[PDB]
């Protein structure tokens, strides 16, 4: 981990969907919470290099759901029950 204190983990639901809510509500900007956020480089499966800004962007639109936009924010893959 950073420095000499150490211990900072993976990032949370709890830190991500306080800060999806503001912006959802018109609130916070597109710009902003990929500044607060200290973006990752990639992560999950298919196409790695997916960035905040397009994240958020899709996720005001409507064309991301806030379980992927948590996901693809944290560096992995959205999940679901896998029913028939």
Known sequence: GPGSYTGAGEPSQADLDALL????DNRLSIEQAVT???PRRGGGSGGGSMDAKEILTRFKDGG????????????RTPAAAPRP
Do not use: K, N
């Open 21 to 24: 809510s503001a912006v959802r």
């Open 36 to 38: 607060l956020l200290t």
């Open 64 to 75: 991301l759901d806030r379980a992927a936009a948590q996901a693809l924010l944290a560096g």
